[PDB]
Design a protein around this ligand. Structure first.
Ligand SMILES: [Ca+2]
Lengths: 240, 8
């Protein structure tokens, strides 16, 4: 997250770190959202590679174990069947991960609330992006979970020629793009949490930024619009 | 664009 600050410890308790095994250790690769005790929502591109993945719930500092974490293997990966690795702008950048065990819900580990099917937020709606991603374009991963206010940019503006043009689809949410605050590498798969009727719901799954950098004016961070996928999500969970 | 990961 570019332009953000350290999040209050465990204050986004559905935020997960998706990690792959790397030599004698594990490496953070992406964010995700816990949506059931044994299901995580992330980006499809995060699981392109056929690696050994785990999810960490209750995480805050990637480099110290603080007693709130639970570490659980990814057992089954269900990518949206229309996702194409070679065509990110087509959309469908979403995957569900069934965990090898159910996590224990507690004050540090909670389910993320999803929007109602079809929900579109008004332009400039209040949202926060969270993640352990780079804190500057070509910078360093965050040791501690970061957050930044990233208000929505509606479809009509985001898909205009001066922003993303036809690259952005109505199955996506855009947020930010003032050239100041943004997601960045290591944040993808994670949530965009948007305030609706006093409750945060996860409206976005972080997908892509400009190839010029993370915080780029008129290139807001682009997310998979979770409310476009509610039926898909429910179908996957019910059949697995 | 560029996906958010390393480096997709
Ligand atoms: Ca930790």
């Amino acid at each position: 997250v570019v332009g953000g600050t350290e999040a209050q410890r465990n204050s986004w308790p559905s935020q997960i770190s998706l990690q792959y095994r790397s030599g004698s250790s594990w490496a953070h690769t992406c964010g995700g959202t816990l949506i059931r005790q044994n299901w995580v929502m992330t980006a499809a591109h995060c699981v392109d590679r056929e690696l050994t993945f785990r999810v960490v719930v209750g995480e805050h500092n990637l480099n110290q174990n603080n007693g709130t974490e639970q570490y659980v293997g990814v057992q089954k990966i269900v990518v949206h069947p229309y996702w194409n690795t070679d065509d990110v702008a087509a959309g469908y950048d979403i995957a569900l991960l069934r965990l090898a065990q159910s996590v224990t819900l507690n004050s540090y580990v909670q389910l993320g609330v999803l929007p109602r099917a079809g929900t579109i937020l008004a332009n400039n709606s209040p949202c926060y992006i969270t993640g352990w991603g780079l804190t500057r374009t070509n910078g360093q991963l965050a040791q501690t979970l970061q957050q930044a206010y990233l208000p929505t940019v509606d479809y009509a503006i985001c898909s205009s020629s001066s922003y993303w043009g036809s690259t952005v689809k109505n199955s996506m949410v855009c947020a930010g793009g003032d050239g100041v605050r943004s997601g960045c590498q290591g944040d993808s798969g994670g949530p965009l949490h948007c305030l609706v009727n006093g409750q945060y719901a996860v409206h976005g799954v972080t997908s892509f930024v400009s190839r010029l950098g993370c915080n780029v004016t008129r290139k807001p961070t682009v997310f998979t619009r979770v409310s476009a996928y509610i039926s898909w999500i429910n179908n996957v969970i019910a059949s697995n | 664009x560029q996906t958010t990961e390393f480096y997709v």
